[PDB]
Design a protein around this ligand. Structure first.
Ligand SMILES: *C(=O)[C@@H](NC(=O)/C(=N/O)c1nsc(N)n1)[C@@H]1NC(C(=O)O)=C(CC2=CCN([C@@H]3CCNC3)C2=O)CS1
Ligand SMILES: [Zn+2]
Length: 828
């Protein structure tokens, strides 16, 4: 009884346009039984056919399967296992010296700094943490049980075959012991160059099947020349034949890359998982997006063949329809490619609705994210991340150059350089001035009269720390006489400060409406901003659960009131808590749809072989936000309409056919993006700081030793005070006593963090004038972004659009995408 693999199902748009599909290639297959067949001859024709075959392909310039885990880089023998380990570490700036356990938790500490995982995620069973990494699209090739790398277990087990119980480490030596193993029996009168072409084919065939099975593939795509060449020379090359094997293709390439996902090799760290699930070794599996989400559905139903006699025919995978409109997704992808392009070296944003001039460097931004949802039912109509990818690079499965060289980037700033990262579900950001409608919604529900106005000072002093409108921080801060509508309209932080705190702050604290942070954070929770969006079981979503009330207490003690200055920040978007575009989308959508919390969906329907369908996304929860008076939202949209026509977004929308509600979020630079190596950065610019390098190293090294001496002593003094405890168990004391004899040598960590902390210290001593800014002068700018959130047509809404350009500074950058995606939707 032999398994047949079903044709993989198709992924289509809401209207039936193909996004993921199949296409047939011509493959070379070798039957390991037939080539190793022996009878009267002393030796199998296996080795000769392997050589013949290859030499044929290398003549036709044809790419072949090479998984043989010893390669020669310019006459030097090396393990591929050994190479993949260090390639992984350098992939995300991990120190080579770092072991399996410290290489894993290092990846964790990065993603935790990037907001993808939380601090409570680290204090967590390591398999549940590998699950969280795995769920977000991270696959560290690390077995958490024995704290070792797959490549090592894989090397030991690969050497175990050919009965090499030697374990003596030598790539040059190992190459031989296998070459003349009882199992291979390769003739010695052949050079290790042509003798290695042999092993590629034999070692492959050996690995895939131990129990007799069906053929193995040695070329996945081969041209007309090498087809007819291998049919006519069939009797010469017994075992070698031409089959057809289907492959994954995405005709629109990079379109909806992140929602769609990719198929590729089964991830090394759970091959046993997939083999008990009934998978072959030579098998492609969805590893991201809907491809993985619906792996079981799209994989279809295996049909056996008897052991030719064809018994049970397979059943093709249900066709899965997304909620994405291709037409709109196209505009959304093209939009964001364009803003990043035109923003670099300057240009014009070309728009159906009026092209705009743009000059360079106002952002210096590499990334972008945008989402568009149906506000009634939470169906996602378009979802674009930049950087993105071609799912096709993976169909065949390149796993060295295209994968390594371009699929990650600088690991000390991954949000702006991870093409596999869906910034829309997985990238959290400080919501800027788009939070304001949450603050205003809280104030309204706690009595606020929208028409109440203030003579805007444009700045609030709180002991020579000044919280001011941007219009103040750049001149005289005044929005003159200012009610809620003008506050939302021109984005007055002073108005929001006053309503968020429930008191008139420049002149004491009174107001008479009773509003605090807890009430704002309440209205955060009500708009589902501490909640997963609905996409998490369909695509990669960063979990949105925010720290609990009792979980925040327990880390404080091992107070809980809100400062005025903090409340001020929280009111206007600045805050501990950061949120993803898809999260905001639900929040703005709730304004647009009259106070309903829609659960987002990307998978619409599946359609079986018998052309019947089912609606996957009709379980989705719509839920009446428990507002005191939902008519309060109509004052938000009254505000957000003025933003479009007269406000912060008139540049884009003022001369736009459709009534658009909108709010802009924008934040300026606040520091610098760290390097992958501080220490070397400081060495590279030692001259530029007017400091001798040798001297600075010799001093930094001195300053360290002096901190150690200091730590060492204060250690000795603690052990000795501890030893004066009258009643101390003898084992306890035998430990402390044995430290003082051989130990009392405290050492610093030897990190980039530590060794570079001390070098910067040495620099400032030998240049007593230089500033941190001047030292950090060469680094990229951190802490800037622009949000545009909008919904339309404002007076009877249908669609919400959220757009973010991180490291961007001009709200033009976010507005114009939003404006295209809304324009397109309404059929203009
Ligand atoms: C809302 O987002 C408000 N922003 C801020 O308070 C911040 N200033 O730094 C902030 N919040 S969180 C963080 N890290 N920083 C006000 N609204 C906005 C808006 O809605 O657009 C304005 C900013 C403004 C517009 C144009 N800007 C750049 C300089 C001029 N050309 C580009 C710009 O910063 C006012 S702040
Ligand atoms: Zn103001």
């Amino acid at each position: 009884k032999l398994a047949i693999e079903a044709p993989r199902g198709e992924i289509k748009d809401r209207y039936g346009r193909l996004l993921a599909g199949n296409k047939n290639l011509f493959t070379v297959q070798v039957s390991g039984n037939d080539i190793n067949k022996k009878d009267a001859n002393k030796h199998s024709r296996a080795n000769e056919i392997s050589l013949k075959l290859i030499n044929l392909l290398e003549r036709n310039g044809e790419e072949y399967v090479d998984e043989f885990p010893i390669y020669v880089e310019n006459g030097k023998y090396y393990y591929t296992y050994d190479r993949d380990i260090r390639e992984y570490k350098s992939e995300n700036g991990i120190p080579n010296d770092y072991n399996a356990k410290e290489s894993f938790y290092y990846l964790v500490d990065k993603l935790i700094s990037a907001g993808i995982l939380s601090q409570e995620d680290k204090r967590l069973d390591a398999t549940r943490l590998q699950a969280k990494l795995n769920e977000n699209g991270y696959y560290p090739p690390i077995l958490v049980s024995k704290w070792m790398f797959t490549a090592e277990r894989d090397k030991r087990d690969w050497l175990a075959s050919y009965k090499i119980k030697e374990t003596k480490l030598s790539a040059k030596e190992a190459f031989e012991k296998v070459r003349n193993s009882d199992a291979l029996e390769i003739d010695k009168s052949l050079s290790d160059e042509d003798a290695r072409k042999i092993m590629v084919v034999r070692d492959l065939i050996k690995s895939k099947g131990y129990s007799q099975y069906n053929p193995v593939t040695i070329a996945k795509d081969v041209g007309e020349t090498t087809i007819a060449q291998i049919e006519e020379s069939a009797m010469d090359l017994v075992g070698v034949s031409i089959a057809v094997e289907p492959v994954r293709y995405y005709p629109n390439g990079s379109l909806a890359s992140h929602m769609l996902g990719y198929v590729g090799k089964m991830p090394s760290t759970q091959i046993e998982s997939y083999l008990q699930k009934g998978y072959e070794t030579g098998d492609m599996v969805g590893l991201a997006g809907v491809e993985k989400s619906n792996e079981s559905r799209l994989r279809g139903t295996d049909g056996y063949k008897m052991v030719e006699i064809e018994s049970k025919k397979p059943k093709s995978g249900d066709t899965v329809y997304l909620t994405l409109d291709k037409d709109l997704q196209e505009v959304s992808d093209n939009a964001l490619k364009q803003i990043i392009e035109v923003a670099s070296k300057g240009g014009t944003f070309k728009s159906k609705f009026g092209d705009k001039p743009i000059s360079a460097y106002a952002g210096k931004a590499q990334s972008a994210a945008l989402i568009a949802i149906d506000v009634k039912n939470g169906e996602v109509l378009a979802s674009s991340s930049y950087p993105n990818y071609d799912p096709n690079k993976f169909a065949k499965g390149i796993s060295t150059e295209d994968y390594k060289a371009l699929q990650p980037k600088n690991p000390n700033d991954l949000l702006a350089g991870s093409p596999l990262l869906n910034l829309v579900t997985q990238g959290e950001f400080q919501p800027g001035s788009s939070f304001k409608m949450l603050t205003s919604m809280a104030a309204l529900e706690n009595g606020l009269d929208p028409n109440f106005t203030i003579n805007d000072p444009g700045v609030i002093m709180l002991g020579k720390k000044s919280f001011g409108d941007y219009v103040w921080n750049h001149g005289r801060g005044n929005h003159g006489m200012t009610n809620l509508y003008k506050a939302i309209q021109e984005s007055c932080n002073i108005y929001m400060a006053t309503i968020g705190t429930g008191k008139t702050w420049p002149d004491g604290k009174s107001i008479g409406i009773d509003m605090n942070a807890n009430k704002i954070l309440e209205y955060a929770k009500l708009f589902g901003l501490d909640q997963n969006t609905g996409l998490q079981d369909e695509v990669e979503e960063r979990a949105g659960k925010v720290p609990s009330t009792e979980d925040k207490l327990k880390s404080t003690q091992a107070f809980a009131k809100w400062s005025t200055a903090d409340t001020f920040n929280l009111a206007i978007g600045q805050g501990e808590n950061a949120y993803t575009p898809a999260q905001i989308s639900r929040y703005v959508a709730a304004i647009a749809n009259g106070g309903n919390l829609v659960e987002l969906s990307v998978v619409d329907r599946a359609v079986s072989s018998d052309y019947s369908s089912v609606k996957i996304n009709d379980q989705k929860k719509v839920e009446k936000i428990p507002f005191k008076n939902p008519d309060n939202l109509k004052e938000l949209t009254k505000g957000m309409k003025l933003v479009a026509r007269q406000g912060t977004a008139k540049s884009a929308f003022a001369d736009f056919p459709i009534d658009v509600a909108a709010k802009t979020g924008t934040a300026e630079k606040s520091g610098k993006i760290p390097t992958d190596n501080e220490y070397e950065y400081l060495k590279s610019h030692m001259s530029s700081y007017n400091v001798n390098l040798n001297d600075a190293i010799k001093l930094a090294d001195k300053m360290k030793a002096e901190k150690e001496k200091e730590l060492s002593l204060a250690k000795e003094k603690e052990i000795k005070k501890k030893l004066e405890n009258k009643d101390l168990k003898d084992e306890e004391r035998k430990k402390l006593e044995e430290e003082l004899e051989d130990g009392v040598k405290v050492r610093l960590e030897d990190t980039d963090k530590v060794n570079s902390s001390y070098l910067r210290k040495a620099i400032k001593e030998l240049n007593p004038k230089i500033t941190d800014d001047q030292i950090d002068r060469f680094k990229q700018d951190y802490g800037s972004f622009t949000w545009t959130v909008a919904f339309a047509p404002a007076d009877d809404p249908e669609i919400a659009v959220v757009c973010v350009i991180p490291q961007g500074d001009s709200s033009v950058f976010s507005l114009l995408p939003t404006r295209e995606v809304i324009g397109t939707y309404m059929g203009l």
